[PDB]
Amino acid sequence: SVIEKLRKLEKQARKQGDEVLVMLARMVLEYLEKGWVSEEDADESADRIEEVLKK
């Protein structure tokens, strides 16, 4: 699930105190629910958020 991936990343960012990445994961989720981003672009966003989280 793209949604489950983004929720897990949001919580990992909350655990790291990474407030920008919290917002990006949270808002990709909101955009996906609103139909403002495609599922494929949300999945790619999750992958990028994960990369930035590791840095």
Author numbering: 1 to 55
Publication passage describing the model:
The design of proteins that bind to a specific site on the surface of a target protein using no information other than the three-dimensional structure of the target remains a challenge. Here we describe a general solution to this problem that starts with a broad exploration of the vast space of possible binding modes to a selected region of a protein surface, and then intensifies the search in the vicinity of the most promising binding modes. We demonstrate the broad applicability of this approach through the de novo design of binding proteins to 12 diverse protein targets with different shapes and surface properties. Biophysical characterization shows that the binders, which are all smaller than 65 amino acids, are hyperstable and, following experimental optimization, bind their targets with nanomolar to picomolar affinities.
